[PDB]
Design a protein around this ligand. Structure first.
Ligand SMILES: Cc1cc(C#N)cc(C)c1Oc1nc(NC2CCN(Cc3ccc(S(N)(=O)=O)cc3)CC2)nc2ccsc12
Ligand SMILES: [Mg+2]
Lengths: 556, 414
């Protein structure tokens, strides 16, 4: 007997106030009971469960299930009730590595640890909660009652406690072997290194040597799966990586669940397939929760899908990470609020790709979206590589300086350089900071009756130019914008405009270059055509000439 | 320090479960080294998966030093931690601190590591050093002693501190010492020369009665802190535009001050005149303007600090490195206003400047009222939350919300 270290037990509790489960054991057929007794007898021999007396008041139902060509019977303990009453745990396995953050490893071994999984003892004081009962034949004797000594399959805490137990055991080996990497997930242990295969097969031996200190038997993963590894949806190849094949289903009838799955795949694909677009397709599922509901595809959605198919024709691959090289991110504007990016260290060899879609909103502009894309890529890069990439942006240095120095909010983009790849992001208008000498001054106003929705919009100027337009089905806010629109329409290339509309100022001072409001869009188009616009605000109803005059003209 | 102090959360509240945000490799490496030493010294211990709580951690560099400091963001735990009345019903905030000619700020948070933390409360201090690219499980720790940044640390330590200060306080009856979180504020009215040494005299005190950053001193001169009343232009020729802007400013001010009038000034704007046309001031308008100027000299009325309400701080970007701000509890009743310029270190970085403004404003609020304000920041949430930790140099963290619509009133503090 070679003494083996015990695996430290994790203390476990039920949620405060809650007690253990008390679920009735279903009736089983004689055949299923015999099967369960055999399985459980073997499991007891191995130490996994132990017979208990009748004092234990808890119970979880057990089932017997059958398979296709393995005419066996398999056991099943339905811990659904016990899981509801078990404390929460730290789940250490939320995110997975992204392949583009990994470094090449000459050699990779995969060990199997499903057997070591059962060496992990269950906290003694908690075992009572795992009790279950095998009913007796014909119900004529007491049922055989058992409880678990090890982490039950399907119990809430088994994944976290197993992973934590393995990491702790592996800790010393990894720290004293800086020339190898060890990754665990489920019953698989992945060991990689840049050592020659013989000298790497010895590290593996030493790892078994180490694992046996806790009596952990671990041989090579049976049926060593040839490259690539099918892991978490990727094809990890020795020199490259990819998503597993992306095949877009052909269809004449497209349904809610089809377009959801279609975006799913397209989204998954967009991390290596550059230029993927999903706005129009995503757009079609605006507010439907019946996944069987069929939806016609807008001609802009068919064009987008067919665009995706073309990108999906030939498989694309990424390269792994080299920390001695620079990290670079390049962004392109795709239109309709959509943005695409590549991250690379050498030209034409992407680590990964991605996309960004603009946030919901009434008004927006290209620079704000580009800024948001940059922040998204920044944060994704800190996760994957632990550092910010250098950016290549389709915006002139001079455009950015004008934008941020004049924008009412604080804003910042990290180290970047211009890349002259159209379309370029630009500022489409810039309001004057001071009134324009020699430019006509338009005093604008509008108003609407809340009952009838009839309104008026118009202006009076210092040259005696005047206009009032009657309007139907309108509101105060719309008439206030309509008035500004009329002044832009009817003025020369330079114009001073005086409004009392705090609503209109709030929109225009946000510097939109595009709107979901056709009327705001029309104002933007007019601003683009002007040479100079000074927009002045005054408070309503204060006797401010011009303002007072036009307020009267429009307040019918 | 033998006996721990019984600590609990507030009724019907669990511990924090706050996501760790991503950290650069250089901050992870710094935290690994720091926590390895803290673990050797017994200040923190590894924890198992039966602990589900979490508080974010990052690393900073204190002003004017090169060594990384661990900073835990205990904001969630602090608001879930029971309100504290350590030994007395409350230490009254010293209204005299804000009047001292010089106030130096000391990081005394390291003194907390000498007091054990109630063993039942430790689990709520859990935190994670994350790995890069999720390549290994984050390193999980909890505190065994009073942590820096936690509400309860000064409260629990307040007995131990009052004694360390007694001989110094007994000797210097006119020096004012105020403790906030990890910081000690020490104000004197004597020239900086002896002030600096007197500060060193207090360090040696804490050094004999006992630090990685205790050596530093953040110097303040709140007697020289300047407010910003409302000012109207003095001009010899007023254009239509000038008068329109003046009427707009006075109309805004009339919500703050009684008796502001714009009738006579508006009277000048009769007709529909060119914005650049010069308008001579009548006598009735000049008098009205003079009366408004006078009203604006006097302070606002009935402005009192209500200690049961939050302090709100609003900030405006004025451009060219200048920032204005107002602190208040109810709208239009400012308790403090201010203006900053030439934030050193970022003439080309808005966000760095705003982060420094937030820290300076928070420092002023601690001095004047003993608590931090809730900020209304002129910045998009995603930009702020990507970058502020890169420029943060304080050991506390206030709360903040984001302004997405441009306030029209930026112009009237311009
Ligand atoms: C070891 C491991 C395996 C899997 C899987 N499934 C997933 C992760 C996250 C793993 O964990 C780490 N993986 C790496 N790099 C990669 C680089 C690319 N390859 C694929 C490959 C290489 C060699 C052969 S080969 N010639 O032996 O047939 C076949 C396949 C695997 C290793 N780096 C780290 C750093 C810390 S953890 C970790
Ligand atoms: Mg009106």
């Amino acid at each position: 007997m070679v003494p083996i270290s015990p695996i430290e037990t994790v203390p476990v509790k039920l949620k405060p106030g809650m007690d253990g489960p008390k679920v009735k054991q279903w009736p089983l057929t004689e055949e299923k009971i015999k099967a369960l007794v055999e399985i459980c007898t073997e499991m007891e021999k191995e130490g996994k469960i132990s017979k208990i007396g009748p004092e234990n008041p808890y119970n979880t139902p057990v089932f017997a299930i059958k398979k296709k060509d393995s005419t066996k019977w398999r056991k099943l303990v339905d811990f659904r009730e016990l899981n509801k009453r078990t404390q929460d745990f730290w789940e250490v396995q939320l995110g997975i590595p992204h392949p583009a953050g990994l470094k090449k490893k000459k050699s990779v071994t995969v060990l199997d640890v499903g057997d070591a999984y059962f060496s992990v003892p269950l906290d003694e004081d908690f075992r009572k909660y795992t009790a279950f009962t095998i009913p007796s034949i014909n119900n004529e004797t007491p049922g055989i009652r058992y409880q678990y000594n090890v982490l039950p399959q399907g119990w809430k805490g088994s994944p976290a406690i197993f992973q934590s137990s393995m990491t702790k055991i592996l800790e010393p080996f990894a720290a004293q072997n800086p020339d190898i990497v060890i990754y665990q997930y489920m019953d698989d242990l992945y060991v990689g290194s840049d050592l020659e295969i013989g000298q790497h097969r010895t590290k593996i031996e030493e790892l078994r040597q180490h694992l046996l200190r806790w009596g952990l038997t671990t041989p090579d993963k049976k049926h060593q799966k040839e490259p690539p590894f099918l892991w978490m949806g990727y094809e990890l190849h020795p020199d490259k990586w990819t998503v597993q094949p992306i095949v877009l289903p052909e269809k004449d009838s497209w349904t809610v669940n089809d377009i959801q799955k279609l975006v799913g795949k397209l989204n998954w694909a967009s991390q290596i397939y550059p230029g993927i677009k999903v706005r129009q397709l995503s757009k079609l599922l605006r507010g439907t929760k019946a996944l069987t509901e069929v939806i016609p595809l807008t001609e802009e959605a068919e064009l987008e899908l067919a665009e995706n198919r073309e990108i999906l024709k030939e498989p694309v691959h990424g390269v792994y990470y080299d920390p001695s090289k620079d990290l670079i991110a390049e962004i392109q504007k795709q239109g309709q609020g959509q943005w695409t990016y590549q991250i690379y260290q050498e030209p034409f060899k992407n680590l990964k790709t991605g996309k960004y879609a603009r946030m919901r909103g009434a008004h927006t502009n290209d620079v704000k979206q580009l800024t948001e894309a940059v922040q998204k890529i920044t944060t994704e890069s800190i996760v994957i590589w632990g550092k910010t990439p250098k950016f290549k942006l389709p915006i002139q240095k001079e455009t950015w300086e004008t934008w941020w120095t004049e924008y009412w909010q604080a804003t910042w983009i990290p180290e970047w350089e211009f890349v002259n790849t159209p379309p370029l992001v630009k500022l489409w208008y810039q309001l004057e900071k001071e009134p324009i000498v020699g430019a006509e001054t338009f005093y604008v106003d509008g108003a609407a009756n809340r009952e009838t929705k009839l309104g008026k919009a118009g202006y009076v100027t210092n040259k005696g130019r005047q206009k009032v337009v009657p309007l139907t089905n309108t509101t105060n806010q719309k008439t206030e914008l309509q008035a500004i629109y009329l002044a832009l329409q009817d003025s020369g290339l330079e114009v001073n405009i005086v409004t009392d509309s705090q609503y209109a100022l709030g929109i225009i001072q946000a510097q939109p270059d595009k709107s979901e409001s056709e009327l705001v869009n029309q104002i933007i188009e007019q601003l683009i055509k002007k040479e100079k616009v000074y927009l002045a605000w005054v408070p309503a109803h204060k006797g401010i000439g011009g303002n007072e005059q036009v307020d009267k003209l429009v307040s019918a | 320090p033998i006996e721990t102090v019984p600590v609990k959360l507030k009724p019907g509240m669990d511990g924090p479960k706050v996501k760790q945000w991503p950290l650069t490799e250089e901050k992870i490496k710094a935290l690994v080294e720091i926590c390895t030493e803290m673990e050797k010294e017994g200040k923190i211990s590894k924890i198992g998966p039966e602990n589900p709580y979490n508080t974010p951690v990052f690393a900073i560099k204190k002003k004017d030093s090169t060594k990384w400091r661990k900073l835990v963001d205990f904001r969630e735990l602090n608001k879930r931690t029971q309100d504290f009345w350590e030994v007395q019903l409350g230490i009254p905030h010293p209204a005299g601190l804000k009047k001292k000619k010089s106030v130096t700020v000391l990081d005394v948070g390291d003194a907390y590591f000498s007091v054990p933390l109630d063993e039942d409360f430790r689990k709520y201090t859990a935190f994670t050093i994350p790995s890069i690219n999720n390549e290994t499980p984050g390193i999980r720790y909890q505190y065994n002693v009073l942590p820096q940044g936690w509400k309860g640390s000064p409260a629990i330590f307040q007995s131990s501190m009052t004694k360390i200060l007694e001989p110094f306080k007994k000797q210097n009856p006119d020096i004012v010492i105020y403790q906030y979180m990890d910081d000690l504020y020490v104000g004197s009215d004597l020239e900086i020369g002896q002030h600096r040494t007197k500060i060193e005299e207090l360090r040696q005190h804490l050094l004999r009665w006992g630090p990685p950053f205790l050596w530093m001193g953040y110097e303040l001169h709140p007697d020289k802190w300047t407010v910003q009343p409302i000012v109207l232009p003095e001009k010899d020729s007023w254009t239509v535009n000038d008068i329109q802007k003046l009427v707009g400013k006075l109309n805004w001010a009339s919500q703050i001050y009684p008796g502001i009038k714009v009738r006579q000034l508006s009277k000048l704007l009769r007709g529909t005149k060119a914005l650049t046309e010069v308008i001579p001031l009548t006598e009735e308008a000049e008098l009205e303007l003079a009366e408004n100027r006078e009203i604006l000299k006097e302070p606002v009325h009935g402005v009192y600090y209500d200690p049961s309400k939050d302090l709100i701080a609003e900030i405006q970007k004025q451009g060219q490195g200048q920032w204005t701000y107002q602190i208040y509890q109810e709208p239009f009743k400012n308790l403090k206003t201010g203006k900053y310029a030439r934030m050193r270190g970022a003439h080309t970085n808005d966000v760095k400047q705003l982060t420094e403004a937030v820290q300076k404003i928070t420092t002023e609020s601690i001095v004047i009222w003993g608590k931090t304000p809730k900020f209304k920041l002129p910045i998009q949430k995603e930009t702020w939350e990507t970058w502020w930790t890169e420029y943060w140099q304080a050991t506390w963290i206030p709360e903040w919300e984001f302004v997405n619509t441009p306030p029209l009133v930026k112009l009237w503090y311009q």
